[PDB]
Amino acid sequence: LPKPFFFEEGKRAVLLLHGFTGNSSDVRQLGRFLQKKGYTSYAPQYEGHAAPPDEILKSSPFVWFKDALDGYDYLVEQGYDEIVVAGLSLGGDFALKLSLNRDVKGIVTMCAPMGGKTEGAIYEGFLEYARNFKKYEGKDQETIDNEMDHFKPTETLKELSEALDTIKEQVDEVLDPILVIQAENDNMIDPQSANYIYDHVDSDDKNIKWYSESGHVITIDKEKEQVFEDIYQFLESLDWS
Ligand SMILES: OB(O)c1ccc(C(F)(F)F)s1
Ligand SMILES: OB(O)c1ccc(C(F)(F)F)s1
Ligand SMILES: *[B@@](*)([O])C1=[C][C]=C(C(F)(F)F)S1
Ligand SMILES: [Ca+2]
Numbered sequence: 229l230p231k232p233f234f235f236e237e238g239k240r241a242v243l244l245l246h247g248f249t250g251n252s253s254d255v256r257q258l259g260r261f262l263q264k265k266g267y268t269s270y271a272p273q274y275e276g277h278a279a280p281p282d283e284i285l286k287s288s289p290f291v292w293f294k295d296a297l298d299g300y301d302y303l304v305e306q307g308y309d310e311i312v313v314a315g316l317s318l319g320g321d322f323a324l325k326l327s328l329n330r331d332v333k334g335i336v337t338m339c340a341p342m343g344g345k346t347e348g349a350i351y352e353g354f355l356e357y358a359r360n361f362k363k364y365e366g367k368d369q370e371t372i373d374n375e376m377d378h379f380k381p382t383e384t385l386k387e388l389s390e391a392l393d394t395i396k397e398q399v400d401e402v403l404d405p406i407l408v409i410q411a412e413n414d415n416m417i418d419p420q421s422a423n424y425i426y427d428h429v430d431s432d433d434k435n436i437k438w439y440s441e442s443g444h445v446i447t448i449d450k451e452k453e454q455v456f457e458d459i460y461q462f463l464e465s466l467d468w469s
């Protein structure tokens with residue numbers, strides 16, 4: 229089952245943050261590519277993730293963001309002072325916010341939401357995970373429909389909507405070098421989010437890349453090798469010691 233991972237290589241480090249309802253395996257191939265290029269990486273795993281869907285509803289985005297910060301702080305404790313934060317999906321929103329809470333050499337956002345119909349993305353993301361999990365449990369279609377019909381929204385999903393709006397409203401405070409990556413065929417979040425992030429950060433050093441044959445979990449999809457190369461080129465451009 230997926231767990232946090234720590235790939236120790238050279239002195240340059242990347243904190244890898246996964247997506248909403250995702251898990252560390254979604255960023256592990258990126259981690260391995262980075263390791264082959266000499267970069268250390270650490271990937272936390274958010275509380276309640278990689279588990280039955282009700283565990284997400286017992287948790288909170290405030291915890292998940294702290295899980296992200298704990299990964300940064302762990303890299304520092306392990307000797308890595310120079311850290312780029314690279315986040316997939318909701319993790320990309322956490323990467324932007326983390327850069328306001330900790331010192332980073334740069335930021336990568338990959339299919340991160342910002343603006344638009346946030347509530348739709350939250351509920352569709354959760355419900356898709358929940359339905360797929362119940363299928364994996366071997367449940368029949370009626371049992372799944374019945375369990376899904378008993379879904380009760382919790383404070384978790386309202387908190388997530390509020391957290392996303394907070395990050396949107398503070399994105400003009402982001403100053404560190406940034407690469408914005410977006411899949412054109414993302415069916416979870418609106419690809420125009422990438423324009424919004426790019427346009428509204430204060431970062432003087434920024435770039436954006438679009439991927440025409442990819443979806444939301446871009447780091448496991450069919451163009452992942454090009455995504456990884458583009459991330460690498462961005463990393464190589466930064467002000468490392
Ligand atoms: O420790 B820190 O820099 C945090 C900033 C926001 C946090 C949350 F708990 F509200 F998510 S913790
Ligand atoms: O609305 B508030 O200022 C928030 C505090 C922490 C947030 C999270 F993004 F970590 F979840 S949002
Ligand atoms: B990527 O895994 C995401 C799916 C739904 C998201 C949110 F609702 F947070 F915007 S992010
Ligand atoms: Ca090695």
Ligand SMILES: [Ca+2]
Pocket residue numbers: 306
């Ligand atoms: Ca150590």
Ligand SMILES: [Ca+2]
Pocket residue numbers: 370371
């Ligand atoms: Ca039945």
Ligand SMILES: [Ca+2]
Pocket residue numbers: 373374377
């Ligand atoms: Ca029904």
Ligand SMILES: [Ca+2]
Pocket residue numbers: 430431432
């Ligand atoms: Ca500026």
